């Protein structure tokens, strides 16, 4: 089993009260999971991914990852695991407009201290697998609404991570290109074996996987 | 009688070393006092054709008119004067000024026009009480409810008695109980004050409450 999680209680300092929001959440994450983790409004979709990645640390819990604890780790070693076996896909326009589409996917290669002989070959082969070879040296400030989302998906699949943490892929576009990015995400587990999870606010756009798990405020309502 | 011609407004957008046409062969008949219910979809021309008839956008080829005065063939100083009295803009993006209260946002079109100071206060007090406001009139829009943020925007673009109220789907960013109440408040404005409006929605459910609908598909009128 790749990732293990059981009884993760996240205690946040509210307005002079202490209310637990994540009450007894548990899921088994193996190598190559066909995951369809669905949620609702106020169920823990935007949360509990920072604890797995290492952005937030739980005060009353520990995230264990095949023998290596994520929560019991310093800040210097937390960023090491985010560049090799962890991917992040967001939808709040998290692209750098000062750079181009080639330098956005090469930015995790620069923090990982990769040599420039294989930086340009690993980055350009990811734009060819997505289908954005035309707007390779183009800034994201002039791209369309459907083309800017595909750069954020190609940003995390450069270093071939084990667990790809996604959050609302079809959130800022219509249903015309919804099947395009769902098919494009389906070419990742069959080529490098990258396990990922899909987050969707309703329960209609997540019918591509099998494990339809629902965790409302930590309680498993599958 | 006729209020707006609506000839072939070919909007040729100039991209990066390219030229794209999005609105081609659009034609409807806006009458003096006639309500309309032009319905669109994801891809059809909405919220930019209203910028063409409103005067915010400038078309490349074509010139629409409004009771003799052309909107496209007009000066920059005269374009804002026509939007102050005989035009209205209602959106669902909550286009209000958060630095003031709810009373000053309704009085904000009356302040640019430089009217009498006794007229800016009495007119804003009567336009709020007809839609369900004046119980929280001296309050900021940040602390208002979800349904109260849209009802104040109806009275904002209705103080100068516009002959053409360009609205764009005011429902959706509020609850469903007060969603049908603001469509009825627009209808009382066309019978008492005589303000001709048009509501542009994406579905045919909201278009059935208004007058006859026109189906549009990438600029071309289907119905």
């Amino acid at each position: 089993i790749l990732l293990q999680c059981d009884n993760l209680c996240k205690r946040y300092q509210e307005g002079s009260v202490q209310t637990d929001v994540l009450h007894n959440v548990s899921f088994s994450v193996g190598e190559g999971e066909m995951m369809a983790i669905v949620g609702s409004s106020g169920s823990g979709k935007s949360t509990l991914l920072h604890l797995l990645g290492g952005l937030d640390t739980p005060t009353s819990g520990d995230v264990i990852f095949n023998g290596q604890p994520m929560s019991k780790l310093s800040s210097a070693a937390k960023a090491e695991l985010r560049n090799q076996k962890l991917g992040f896909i967001y939808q709040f326009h998290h692209l750098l407009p000062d750079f181009t589409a080639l330098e956005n996917v090469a930015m995790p290669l620069l923090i990982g201290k990769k040599k420039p002989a294989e930086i340009n070959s690993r980055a350009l082969e990811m734009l060819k697998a997505v289908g954005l070879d035309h707007r390779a040296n183009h800034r994201p400030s002039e791209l369309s609404g459907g083309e800017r989302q595909r750069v954020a998906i190609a940003r995390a699949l450069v270093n071939n991570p084990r667990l790809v943490l996604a959050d609302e892929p079809t959130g800022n576009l219509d249903a015309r290109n919804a099947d395009s990015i769902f098919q494009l995400l389906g070419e990742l587990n069959r080529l490098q074996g990258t396990a990922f999870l899909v987050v969707t606010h309703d329960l209609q756009l997540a019918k591509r996987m099998s494990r339809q798990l629902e965790m409302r405020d930590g309680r498993l309502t599958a | 009688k006729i209020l707006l011609q609506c000839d072939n407004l070919c909007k040729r957008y100039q991209e990066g070393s390219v030229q794209t046409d999005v609105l081609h062969n659009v034609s409807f008949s806006v009458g003096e006092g006639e309500m309309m219910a032009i319905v669109g979809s994801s891809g059809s021309g909405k919220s930019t054709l209203l910028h063409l008839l409103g005067g915010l956008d400038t078309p490349t080829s074509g010139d629409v008119i409004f009771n003799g005065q052309p909107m496209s063939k007009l000066s920059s100083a005269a374009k804002a004067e026509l939007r102050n009295q005989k035009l209205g803009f209602i959106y669902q993006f909550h286009h209000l000024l958060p630095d003031f209260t709810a009373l000053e946002n309704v009085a904000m079109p009356l302040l640019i026009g430089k009217k009498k100071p006794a007229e800016i206060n009495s007119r804003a007090l009567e336009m709020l009480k007809a839609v369900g406001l004046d119980h929280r009139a001296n309050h900021r829009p940040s602390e208002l409810s979800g349904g109260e943020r849209q009802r104040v925007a109806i009275a904002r673009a209705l103080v100068n008695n516009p002959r053409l109220v360009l609205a764009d789907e005011p429902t959706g960013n509020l609850d469903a109980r007060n969603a049908d109440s603001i469509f009825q408040l627009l209808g009382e404005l066309n019978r008492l004050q005589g303000t001709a409006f048009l509501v542009v929605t994406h579905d045919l459910q909201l278009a059935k409450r208004m007058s006859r609908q026109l189906e549009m598909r990438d600029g071309r009128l289907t119905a």
Partner: protein, 409 residues
Amino acid sequence: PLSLLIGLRFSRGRRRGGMVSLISVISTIGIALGVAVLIVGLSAMNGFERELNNRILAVVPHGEIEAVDQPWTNWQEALDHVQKVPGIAAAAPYINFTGLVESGANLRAIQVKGVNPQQEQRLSALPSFVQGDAWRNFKAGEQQIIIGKGVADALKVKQGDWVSIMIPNSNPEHKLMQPKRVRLHVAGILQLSGQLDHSFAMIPLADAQQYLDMGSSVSGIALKMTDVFNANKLVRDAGEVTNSYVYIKSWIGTYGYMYRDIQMIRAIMYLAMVLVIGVACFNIVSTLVMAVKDKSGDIAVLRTLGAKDGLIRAIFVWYGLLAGLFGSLCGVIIGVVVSLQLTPIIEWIEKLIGHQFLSSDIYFIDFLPSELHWLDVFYVLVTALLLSLLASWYPARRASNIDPARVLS
């Protein structure tokens, strides 16, 4: 009353966020450093001009005429030709000397002048800076002499002891003899600033003729002018009334460099403070272009209501002046406290760092005065506002070109 572009923009300045609460403190004290220091820096030069006409210009005679190495024989009928001149107020004779003081082997060279004690109150104020209770002890027949403060610091003497001076040799023809000396008692000391206190001494005219074995004869005629700046045109025509040419001098060759140096700092500190507010006006530009793109969803709302291009361009000009007027007036209200109470301020730093500055050896005066005026306060408010007008006009033209069709409206 209130305008549409002034009274409706006080609520726009109430903006909060992350670390924006400390930027309003930096932008206030950043523009107050070129206003509060300019208030004290310009009022201190006005204090130097006040002490110039009181401690320097009011004790030295301006116009002085002397013969060509001859005693003034016809000096009785040469006084009416000076007094009946439109611009000459008073006149008094004087006999200058060059003698030293040997009272304990000290190096001090003073300039003894034969002024008249009865006529010294009509042209200037000689005994107005004497520590004694009175000055009417200058009679005829007591051989008294009054010295300054800098002479007494090297002589190590007090008031009321017989000091020894060196009388120059008053020989009729050119011959060398023994030096003449006499012991005289000092009748009090005097102090003005510390500069003119070590080379200033005077004697009565009745006691100066007995030291030179002469009768009624002087060696110089002083005068007094109404206006001081035109001291090079009323003393030229008043020299040919006695003979062909005499030794003509004025205060320009000796104390004329003080008026030039007091105007050079005003022509240096003024433009140096424009460069302080000029970089401080760039802090207004850094918070105005940021206030356009962050508030880009608000300018499109006003353009849909009927705001013209002349109204939107006038929004951010007076909006940047709200942060400029609060910072400029924050240096004005603290500049009055430093200027009016500078004397406990300068004396506080001199007793902490060690040796004091502004010594009374070669400088102008000892203290640092500050005559605060009200015309310089008005001259720095328009300067701080005209420099902020160009800093708020260039981001205002950028916000006026923001079309509502490009932004999501």
